[PDB]
Structure 1
Amino acid sequence: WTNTSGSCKGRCFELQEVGPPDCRCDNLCKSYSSCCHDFDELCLKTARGWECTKDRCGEVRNEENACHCSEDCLSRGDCCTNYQVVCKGESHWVDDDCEEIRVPECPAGFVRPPLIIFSVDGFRASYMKKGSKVMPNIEKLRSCGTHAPYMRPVYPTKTFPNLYTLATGLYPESHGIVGNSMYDPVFDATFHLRGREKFNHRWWGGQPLWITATKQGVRAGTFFWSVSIPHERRILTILQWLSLPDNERPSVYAFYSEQPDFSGHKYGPFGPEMTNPLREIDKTVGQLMDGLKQLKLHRCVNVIFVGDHGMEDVTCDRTEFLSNYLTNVDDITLVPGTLGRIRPKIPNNLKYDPKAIIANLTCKKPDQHFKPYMKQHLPKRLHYANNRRIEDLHLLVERRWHVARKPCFFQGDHGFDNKVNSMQTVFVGYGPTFKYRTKVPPFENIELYNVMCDLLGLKPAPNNGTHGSLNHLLRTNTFRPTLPEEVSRPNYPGIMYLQSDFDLGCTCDDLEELNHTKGSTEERHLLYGRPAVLYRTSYDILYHTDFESGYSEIFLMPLWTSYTISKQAEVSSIPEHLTNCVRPDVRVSPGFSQNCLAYKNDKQMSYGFLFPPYLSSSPEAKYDAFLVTNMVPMYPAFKRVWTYFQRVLVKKYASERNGVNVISGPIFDYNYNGLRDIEDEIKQYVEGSSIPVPTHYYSIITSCLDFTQPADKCDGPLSVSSFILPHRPDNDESCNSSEDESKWVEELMKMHTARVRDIEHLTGLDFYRKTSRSYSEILTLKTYLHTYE
């Protein structure tokens, strides 16, 4: 209970941690209705607006006013932000030339540059193109500071998952805010964005920046603001806190605005009405910068200008209805709109039949504007599966569309797949620790927490960023990354077995003495060093004319297979006599090998090869491609994809990129946590055998960023694209799979694009250990996602 008759005199926006039964005066008190009865009158002053006028200059200080233009206001830290411009002939910050801030220029008493995060809801990255004509203050931040052309949000591209991701460095599946709306079947409770439950700490996981700071002795200003507090007052409050005594002044601050999200929803991203809210936001930025300048802090503070997600054209006319596909929609609950999550209306309703539902939702309309997924089948890049709050049944919705349960005041919405262009949002960093007039490649918002930690001298809590991947944003305070230690060293087996030692049921139509040393194989096909294996296991390096692999004696297949294809390389067919050829590998024990019998017995499982026979350098070398140690279990459905990739696409990539280096391999993630499975977690084997079945297959495709140089002779920076393809028994995901592979396979692969870093989590491997590049630059390379947009 709150004793409300207390007073907010000399307590306005206190940073005091205060609870029941006492009165509160902080920026969240209204959200709990726990404000002292005089909070409004004392703390939310609105008198005479937010700007000094010439007639107010030198006024006698009236404490009734929202802000002051009195002679004393500067020391008391409560001038209106334009005070000096109007009364002291100063210029607005925006009208001053940009000057590089080489070191922090802070008043005495400041020990480190403060950090202010200026967050804007629904600020689509392409809004920046409007420039200084519309947003002159923001355009100055952007061009003088450090900027990305866009920042990638997390999926779902809505507010609560994205804000909490910014604050923690964690994917939603990890921090627990997997949506604006959620149901937790263990709590048997519903989370609503507005409502009582969301204030319960039990929903929120990980460790947000304000906690990380506090726990390490760095004071934070309160990040959240009760919605009724006007933006002008939020700014004045931040400024006032910045004028506090040395022993009270916070080091980190956050502002937030619900715009331009609100107007975007009403009028759509390209609506003419969007100009006004954007001007209004810019004005708030100008107030902050003018205020910092008055305080002599405009070359002292680091400012981050950042959004949670973008905004797409979405209207009532573009709504799919589940009732068009399903008979009894009143028995399910749907989280609707720009994504779909389905559960039975009655929790744990036994008659709930998700397989039948999915079947009715699969490719039933030629123009179908969503696609059903069991969550473990969603593209791995979304990292959206490992949480009890994420329904098994998901609908990825096509950009510009809505899905609803059954049968216009809006023109815009967001929430779609986070690689969609309209969903991209903004990042600008300005201040002494940031670079001057520097553009950086787009990056994911999960990376920001580490950097904000660096900016504040903090040690980040465990998170999903890759610390160091954003060192190129910063002048100083960079984080020196260290290469992870190899845990398992490889063996280099020679000939140790006789063809007669082998009894695998394999057959092949193969001079005796002419029947594999290192030589130049490493330098030709393994360009960036061997991957390091970061877990305890047993594996062998195997060399070949056309490829190298790190073969696992535990999982009975390569962990990685590496090869280079030159621009001019030739694609050849598999000779008729070799169609079913599998050859034992005398370097490897028959006990550590697969066998062809298990495949003959398994009516549903077939096999493929990691190095493709189609790209062998010679008919002789081609026999290497048929080694049992190059073999992997593949469903016939998957083989349609894999053979098309191997036979047609790799060559196409080599032609287009002036050669390519390829690293392919298996991934096991049966528990859908995005992490390499341990042995006990694998759930499927080839029939009657111990050959484990991968849940996915990866490929990492590298070339020279300077495409004029061949991939194998690259001097400088690298270019990479990767995928993690789901290993599935059907092509139900591809609505056009009945057609030739030229009509559907690349579309599937594009959806399952991935970062090398994603593959590293899933494999326990560490790539690119041996290059001519800095480790930070390599970290940047590993977090790159090729999006095809």
Structure 2
Amino acid sequence: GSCKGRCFELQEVGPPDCRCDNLCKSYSSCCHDFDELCLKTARGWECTKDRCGEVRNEENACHCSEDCLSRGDCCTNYQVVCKGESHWVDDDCEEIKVPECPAGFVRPPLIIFSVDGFRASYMKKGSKVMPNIEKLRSCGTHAPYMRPVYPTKTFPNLYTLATGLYPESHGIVGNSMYDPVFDASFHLRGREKFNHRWWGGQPLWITATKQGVRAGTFFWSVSIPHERRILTILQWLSLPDNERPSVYAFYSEQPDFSGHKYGPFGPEMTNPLREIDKTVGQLMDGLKQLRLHRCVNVIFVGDHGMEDVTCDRTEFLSNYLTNVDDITLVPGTLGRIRAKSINNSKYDPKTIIAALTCKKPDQHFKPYMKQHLPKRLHYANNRRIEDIHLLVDRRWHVARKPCFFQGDHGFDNKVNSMQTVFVGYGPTFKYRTKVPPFENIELYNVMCDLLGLKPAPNNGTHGSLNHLLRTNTFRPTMPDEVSRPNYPGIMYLQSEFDLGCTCEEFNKRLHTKGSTKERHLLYGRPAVLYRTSYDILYHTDFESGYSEIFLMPLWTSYTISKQAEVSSIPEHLTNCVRPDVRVSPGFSQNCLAYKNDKQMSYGFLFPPYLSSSPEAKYDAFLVTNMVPMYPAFKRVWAYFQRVLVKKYASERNGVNVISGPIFDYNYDGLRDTEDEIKQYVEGSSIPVPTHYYSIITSCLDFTQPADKCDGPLSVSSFILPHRPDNDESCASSEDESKWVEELMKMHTARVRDIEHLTGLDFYRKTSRSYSEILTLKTYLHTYE
């Protein structure tokens, strides 16, 4: 019952007996002599010349004795001070072609060095402020920035890093949360967070253990100083082969702690950043002492950034609501609202939202029902996410009712100040290599590959980060189609239709297989990865995949050149809908349903505004090009089609557009089955989409047009909520030029998001490698 020879022991002793592990303080369960034996601090963390070849005094924090290297408990500068070696940072970058591990090591170990609140722009402070970090970044592989998950808080992002899962899937939806099934609350401070019931998914340390790879204890009690954490990892690395872990993690509270007090760009932040870099230097010096500097893979990673936030920029819910005592708020850089007491007829969340919507001219938050939040946030499918959510403007706070802190974080994850860091260094990482920015959900697959592990099912796209690594244990393969398209010719007469709406004989080559494929399907046909029956429909200006089940297109593909002219809908074609002779009356929509539904109207996927001729314009009014649209939504859609597509074509030297409907009534981010569709157009089997997407593709080399592109592609995409009002847009009374683009930028998306929501697979026939295509699919156009 003591810590004699057990300090930071990898085994965890069960109750009641006392412990000597990393987290014994966090449970208040350490042995009587834990601080005496394990938290040694005498004579600091640095050897001095007078200590060289000293006899071991066991009261010292670290050692300068000739027995220390074998134990791994030397001070990190021992060989520099006592053996005339250089610091790691003073050595030049040398390419690590293969791992160079000492005897015993069957694989390169992984060191995860996670720094709290390390904003991406701090990297610009350079080798002046952070020599060690700048060497890792220069010599190794790095991105401009890494995107965190929403909310951009500590716990959701640390656990996302460990699982590859979105917060809604792993369950840690915030630093604070209530679970109605448990009827308990989780808090950053306190003992409740230690209970396993909160934590879903499978984090890296469990994935490792289950596949026979030993993991160090990832988490450190705040009492343990940063130098003690580094020495502990160095001692663990000196263990026998059967006791030694292959994966470790260091966590730092800085620069987050100091960012909170002083804000992100204070002159006070230089000191935190120097301390962090000094600590990195101690690790890299320590690894060099053990001849592990060209063996271990190191990941320098942050959980989120930091924004300027002060007490004077606080919105109060009592300035909007008359009954803030009947509701519970998770306050701060985000809002989550809940009823105070259960069983309250007075509490209607739809009236609360209405009361919080566009009420002051300069209002610095926006309310949402969680299912109406942008889909890119993936913040809805969990019982711990409150129905009512407030997205708060950058630099602001929200509190319930009416300084020491100048910084905070937790805002929308595409906000520039919330972006964080990634650096990879070691044998498996590439040498002096810059990679495009990526999302922290992708890192778990990378870390599994660095340890030879099969990842558990997660939300990363395995293969999308292969370009970070020298050698790739995982080769992504493209999934096969589950459903082959039908290609119906002309079958029925126009006389034999009766769809209830007023509006070829000379043209034999009408709607035939010609150059439609080459003009309008630039990257091959989208593959349907679920079981359904659908038809391919060719036209002069566009191709489409028409679902016979949902009675509309799943996708519509067209290519607008830079020089394309916009035209108007003629007065005679304004209420025009033609039947499609290639599709049966049974599998077609009818106009009668849209007359019966007073709320609902219709729009077109391929725009009649962009048609190539007066002849070809008639193809846009086919019933197979038609989809259900609320009048409110048609303001947005008509503006996109008539104005914005041309604008993008003009800006990007032509664009290829792929547009279509999404059904996600259970808000899980996944394609709905027909059972889960909860709304249809009045008295018919035509389903109502929850969202509409478009994918806008062009050549990254803008000097080449979109239809003659040799090299990489550039993409931007959106998933627009299909809502009966424009209450989300506070300026929707003004001209569409003052608010529709802002709405679309808020609802930007990855092509991967649209694939989960549609069951489609895009970009199947290109000249690019599949790996490069997976990176293109995971890209988000942020507009920052």
Q: Please tell me the TM-score bracket, short chain as reference.
A: over 0.9
Give the superposition deviation at 1:384: 0.1
Q: Give the SS at the match of 1:343.
A: strand
C-alpha contact (below 8 Å) 2:374/2:746 kept by paired residues:
yes
Q: Greater CA deviation, 10-19 or 536-545?
A: 10-19
SS in 2 for 1:723: strand
Residues 300, 603 of structure 1: alpha-carbon distance in 2 compared, 3 angstrom cutoff: same
CA distance in 2, matches of 1:184, 1:270: 37
CA contact (8 A) 2:452 2:473 kept: no
Residues 513, 249 of structure 1: CA spacing in aligned structure 2 closer, same or farther, 3 A cutoff? closer
Distance 1:284 1:79 in 2: 15
Go from structure 1 to structure 2 and tell me whether the alpha carbon gap of 1:497 and 1:55 turns closer, same or farther (over 3 Å shift): same
> Distance in 1 between the 2:601 and 2:780 partners?
31
Deviations 1:478-531, CA, capped at 9 Å, x for gaps: 420011110000000001111122111021099476861221111110011111
Per-residue CA deviations over 1:22-63 (Å, capped at 9, x if unaligned) read 221111111111211111111111111111011111111111
Tell whether the 8 Å contact from 1:509 to 1:581 is kept in structure 2 after alignment: no
Shift of 1:647: 0.4
Distance 1:371 1:61 in 2: 63
In structure 2, how many angstroms separate the alpha carbons of the residues matched to 1:496 and 1:511? 17
Asked whether the 8 Å contact 1:455–1:477 carries over to 2, the reply is no
Question: Could you tell me how far 1:644 is from its partner in structure 2?
Answer: 0.3
TM-score by length of 2: 0.99
**1:112-165, Cα deviation, whole Å (9 max, x unpaired):** 100000000000000111011111100111111100010000000000000000
Cα distance between partner residues in 2 of 1:89 and 1:210: 38
SS of the residue corresponding to residue 590 of structure 1 reads coil
Pair 1:242 & 2:237 matched = yes
Distance 1:324 1:123 in 2: 34
Checking the alignment, whether the CA contact within 8 Å between 2:381 and 2:667 is kept in structure 1 is yes
In the TM superposition, what is the alpha-carbon distance from 1:280 to its structure 2 partner? 0.3
User: 1:261 maps to which residue?
Assistant: 256
In structure 2, C-alpha distance between the alignment counterparts of 1:23 and 1:397, rounded to whole Å = 45
Taking a change above 3 Å as real, the CA distance of residues 509 and 775 of structure 1, as seen in their structure-2 partners, is closer
Cross-structure match for 1:405? 400
Pair 507,114 (structure 1): closer, same or farther in 2 beyond 3 Å: same
SS of the counterpart of 1:541? strand
C-alpha contact 1:612 1:647 (8 A) present in aligned 2: yes
- Please say if residues 669 and 676 of structure 1, whose CA atoms lie closer than 8 Å, have aligned partners that are also in contact: yes
Contact 2:335 2:389 (C-alpha < 8 Å) held by counterparts: yes
How far is the alpha carbon of 1:617 from its aligned partner?
A: 0.4
Structure 2 counterpart SS, 1:84: helix
CA RMSD in angstroms comes to 1.0
Aligned residues of 1:509 and 1:578 also touching (Cα < 8 A): no
1:390, distance to aligned residue in structure 2 (A): 0.3
Distance in 1 separating the partners of 2:542 and 2:124? 47
CA distance in 2, matches of 1:538, 1:547: 20
* More displaced 10-residue stretch of structure 1: 348-357 or 581-590: 348-357
How many angstroms apart in 2 are the aligned matches of 1:573 and 1:48?
A: 82
CA contact (8 A) 1:114 1:251 kept: yes
Q: Verify the 8 A CA contact 1:122 1:260 in the aligned structure 2.
A: yes
Q: Deviation string for 1:727-776 (max 9, x for gaps)?
A: 00000000000011011000000000000000000000000011101000
> Following the alignment from structure 1 to structure 2, what is the Cα–Cα distance between the partners of residues 502 and 81?
84
Cα gap change, 1:135 to 1:510, in 2 (>3 Å): farther
CA distance in 1, matches of 2:636, 2:247: 50
1:100 and 2:95 matched: yes
Query: How far did 1:417 drift?
Result: 0.2
Deviation at 1:358, TM superposition (A): 1.0
Deviations 1:224-273 (A, max 9, x none): 01110000000000000101111111000000000000000000001110
Which position in structure 1 is the counterpart of 2:704?
A: 709
Summarize the Cα distance change of 1:49–1:347 in structure 2 as closer, same or farther, 3 Å threshold. farther
1:641-687: CA deviation from partner (whole Å, max 9, x where unpaired): 00000000000000100000000000000000000000000011111
1:208-237 Cα distance to aligned partner (Å, 9 max, x none)? 000000000000000001110000000000
Q: Deviations over 1:271-327 (max 9, x none)?
A: 110000110000000000000000001000000000000000000110011110100
Residues 509 and 577 in structure 1, CA contact (< 8 A), matched pair in contact too: no
Q: Confirm or deny: 8 A CA contact 1:468 1:478 kept in the other structure.
A: no
**Quick one: distance in 1 between partners of 2:191 and 2:508?**
80
How many angstroms apart in 2 are the aligned matches of 1:713 and 1:159?
46
Q: Verify the 8 A CA contact 2:504 2:510 in the aligned structure 1.
A: no
Residue 17 of structure 1, CA deviation: 3.1
Match in the other structure for 2:770: 775
Unmatched 5+ residue regions in structure 2?
Answer: none
Distance 1:583 1:266 in 2: 65
Q: Is 1:496 the equivalent of 2:485? A: no
**Cα drift, residue 21 of structure 1:** 2.4
Q: CA deviation at 1:109?
A: 1.1
Whole-angstrom distance in 2 between the partners of 1:738 and 1:510: 46
Local SS of the residue matching 1:139: helix
2:63 touches 2:74 (CA, 8 Å); kept in 1?
yes
Distance in 1 separating the partners of 2:148 and 2:190: 25
Q: Contact 2:27 / 2:191 at 8 angstroms: preserved in 1?
A: no
Q: Which moved more, 1:744-753 or 1:66-75?
A: 66-75
In 2, are the aligned partners of 1:124 and 1:424 still within 8 Å (CA)?
Answer: yes
Q: Are the structure 2 counterparts of residues 84 and 513 from structure 1 closer, same or farther at C-alpha, using a change threshold of 3 Å? A: closer
Q: Count residues with an aligned counterpart.
A: 784
Matched residue, 2:614: 619
Q: 1:462 aligns with which of 457, 464, 476?
A: 457
Equivalent residues of 2:169, 2:382 under 8 A apart: yes
CA distance in 1: counterparts of 2:273 and 2:519, whole angstroms: 54
CA distance 1:39–1:514, shift in 2 (3 Å): closer
Contact 2:561 2:653 in 1 (8 A): yes
Distance in structure 1 (CA, Å) of the matches to 2:473 and 2:521: 31
| Rounded Cα–Cα distance in structure 2 between residues aligned with 1:74 and 1:27 | 22
CA-CA distance at 1:76 after TM superposition = 2.2
Tell me, in whole angstroms, the C-alpha distance in 1 between the residues paired with 2:255 and 2:504.
69
Of 641, 644, 652 in structure 1, the residue corresponding to residue 647 of structure 2 is: 652
Go from structure 1 to structure 2 and tell me whether the alpha carbon gap of 1:109 and 1:406 turns closer, same or farther (over 3 Å shift): same
Distance 1:514 1:191 in 2: 66
The answer to whether the Cα contact below 8 Å between 1:661 and 1:701 also exists between their aligned partners in 2 is: yes
- 1:358-417, Cα deviation, whole Å (9 max, x unpaired): 111100011000000000000000000000000000000000000111001110000000
Whether contact under 8 Å (1:697, 1:724) holds in the other structure is yes
Contact 2:262 2:407 in 1 (8 A): yes
SS of 1:782 mapped into structure 2: helix
Distance 1:560 1:235 in 2: 54
Query: Aligned pair in 2 of structure 1 residues 514, 758: CA closer, same or farther (>3 Å)?
Result: closer
2: CA distance between counterparts of 1:318 and 1:409? 14
Offset at residue 347 of structure 1 (A)? 3.2
Q: Deviations over 1:9-28 (max 9, x none)?
A: 11111111321122211111
Q: Deviations over 1:690-742 (max 9, x none)?
A: 10000000000000010110000100100000000000000000000001101
Residues 86 and 513 from structure 1, CA distance in 2 versus in 1: closer, same or farther, beyond 3 angstroms?
Answer: closer
Per-residue deviation at 1:348? 4.5
Task: Report the secondary structure of 1:701's partner residue.
Answer: strand
Establish whether residue 753 from structure 1 lines up as the match of residue 764 from structure 2: no
Q: 1:718 to 1:515 in 2, by over 3 A?
A: closer
1:675 partnered with 2:651: no
Q: 1:365 to 1:488 in 2, by over 3 A?
A: same
Task: Indicate the SS of the match to 1:32.
Answer: coil
TM-score (norm 1): 0.99
Contact 2:3 2:37 in 1 (8 A): yes
Tell me the alpha carbon deviations over residues 549-595 of structure 1, each in whole angstroms, 9 at most, x when there is no partner: 00000000000000000111111111111011100000000000000
Q: Please give the residue correspondences for 1:509-520 in structure 2 after superposition, counting only pairs within 5 Å.
A: 511=506, 516-520=511-515
For residues 273 and 428 of structure 2, the distance between their equivalents in structure 1, rounded to whole angstroms, comes to 27
